[PDB]
Design a protein around this ligand. Structure first.
Ligand SMILES: NC(=O)c1ccc[n+]([C@@H]2O[C@H](COP(=O)([O-])OP(=O)(O)OC[C@H]3O[C@@H](n4cnc5c(N)ncnc54)[C@H](OP(=O)(O)O)[C@@H]3O)[C@@H](O)[C@H]2O)c1
Ligand SMILES: O=C(O)Cc1nn(Cc2nc3cc(C(F)(F)F)ccc3s2)c(=O)c2ccccc12
Length: 315
C-alpha cells in the first residue's frame, strides 16, 4: 500500500523525497520531477535553507494541475532556535510562506534540543559548545498543539526523540494531541529495533531518514562504513535484480516505516520510487537487520552536552 494511517486520521505516503543538501539551484527541478513520477510526500526543513525553491516546484505543479493540494503530503520541521512559545507560530508561518502553502500536513519538532534564539542556527560559545535555550520539550509541544488548533498544520510530531523523550510527551500533563510521527535516522547500520517497537506500540508512525547512509553528508570520512558499497547489501540487490539503493529504500517500507531518500538526480529520483514492485524475504529482512552497528550520520559533537541530547541513551 502507498500510504500509512496516522493517529490524526489522515494518510501519509510511505515514500517521500528528502531535501537536505539539495542545492537551491537544483531542488526546484528535483521536486518537479519527483511529482511527475509519483512522489506525493516531500520532507522539508527551514534549516535546509531551500524551502523557497521547494515551494516553487510545489506551486507550479499545483498550478499546472498535475496534482491537487489534498493529494500532497508536505512535512517541515521547527528548528532548535525557535523552541520558545513566542517564536513557534512565526517559524511555522515563515515555512508556510516559503513553501507557498496555507497549511502543512505534518510539522515536526526537528530535534529535542532548544538552542538560543537569534539569526544563527547553531549559536556556539567561544569554545564551540552549542548554546542552549532554557525551554523544555513539553512547553514546545504545547506550542505545536496550538498550531493544529489554528489550522496551520494538520498533524504534529517529533524527530530525533529517544524512547524516554517520546515517553515524556505521551505522559505530558494535559496532553492534547499525541505525536503522529517520530522521524529518526534508520538504516541497516542503525536498525533501531527498540525505539521503533516502542513508537509503533503507541500508534506513532516512524519515518526513517538517511536510508542510504547520507553519502553527501559534509562530514563523511573514508573509513566510515558505506551502505551503498557494502558487498553484502549489493548481493541482496543483485538477487532481486534491483539496485542497492532500491533495497535500502524497500527495507524500511517492510518494517511499516515511512522513508524519505534524498536525491537531486532525475534518474535516481525515478529509480528510488520504483520500489513497490518487489519484496524482500523475511530472511533478507533479518539479514539486513543483522548489519546493525549503531552508526549515526547525524549526531553533531558540538551538541553532546545539551541537557536534552538524545543519544547518550540506550534508546
Ligand atoms: N529529521 C532530521 O534530523 C533529519 C536528519 C537527516 C536527514 N533528514 C531527511 O532525510 C532525507 C534523506 O537523508 P539524507 O539526505 O541524509 O541522505 P540519503 O537520502 O540517505 O542519501 C542522499 C545521498 O544519496 C544519493 N543517492 C540518492 N539516490 C541514490 C541512488 N538511487 N543511487 C545512488 N546514490 C543515491 C544522493 O545523491 P544525489 O542527490 O546527487 O542524487 C545523496 O548524496 C534528508 O534529505 C532530509 O529530508 C532528516
Ligand atoms: O537536522 C537535520 O535535518 C540534518 C542535519 N544534521 N546535522 C547533524 C546534527 N546533529 C544534531 C544533534 C542535535 C542534538 F539534539 F543531538 F543535540 C541537535 C541538532 C543536530 S543537527 C547538522 O549539523 C545539520 C546542519 C545543517 C543542516 C542540517 C543538519
Amino acid at each position: 500500500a502507498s500510504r500509512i494511517l496516522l493517529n490524526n486520521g489522515a494518510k501519509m505516503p510511505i515514500l517521500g523525497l528528502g531535501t537536505w543538501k539539495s542545492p537551491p539551484g537544483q531542488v526546484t527541478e528535483a521536486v518537479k520531477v519527483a511529482i511527475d513520477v509519483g512522489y506525493r510526500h516531500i520532507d522539508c526543513a527551514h534549516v535546509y535553507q531551500n524551502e523557497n525553491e521547494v515551494g516553487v516546484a510545489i506551486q507550479e505543479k499545483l498550478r499546472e494541475q498535475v496534482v491537487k493540494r489534498e493529494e500532497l503530503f508536505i512535512v517541515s520541521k521547527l528548528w532548535c532556535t525557535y523552541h520558545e512559545k513566542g517564536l513557534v507560530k512565526g517559524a511555522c508561518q515563515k515555512t508556510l510562506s516559503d513553501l507557498k502553502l496555507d497549511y502543512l500536513d505534518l510539522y515536526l519538532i526537528h530535534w529535542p534540543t532548544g538552542f538560543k534564539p537569534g539569526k544563527e542556527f547553531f549559536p556556539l560559545d567561544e569554545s564551540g559548545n552549542v548554546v542552549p535555550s532554557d525551554t523544555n520539550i513539553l512547553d514546545t509541544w504545547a506550542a505545536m498543539e496550538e498550531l493544529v488548533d489554528e489550522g496551520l498544520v494538520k498533524a504534529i510530531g517529533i524527530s530525533n526523540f529517544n524512547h524516554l523523550q517520546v515517553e515524556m510527551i505521551l505522559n505530558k500533563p494535559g496532553l492534547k494531541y499525541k505525536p503522529a510521527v517520530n522521524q529518526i535516522e534508520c538504516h541497516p547500520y542503525l536498525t533501531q529495533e527498540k525505539l521503533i517497537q516502542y513508537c509503533q506500540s503507541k500508534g506513532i508512525v516512524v519515518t526513517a531518514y538517511s536510508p542510504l547512509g547520507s553519502p553527501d553528508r559534509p562530514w563523511a570520512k573514508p573509513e566510515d562504513p558505506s551502505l551503498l558499497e557494502d558487498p553484502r547489501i549489493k548481493a541482496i540487490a543483485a538477487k532481486h535484480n534491483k539496485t542497492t539503493a532500491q533495497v535500502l529504500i524497500r527495507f524500511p517500507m517492510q518494517r511499516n516505516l515511512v522513508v524519505i531518500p534524498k536525491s537531486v538526480t532525475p534518474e535516481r529520483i525515478a529509480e528510488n520510487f520504483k520500489v513497490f514492485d518487489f519484496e524482500l524475504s523475511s530472511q533478507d529482512m533479518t539479514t539486513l537487520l543483522s548489519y546493525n552497528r549503531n552508526w549515526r550520520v547525524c549526531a553533531l559533537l558540538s551538541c553532546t552536552s545539551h541537557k536534552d541530547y538524545p543519544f547518550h541513551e540506550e534508546f
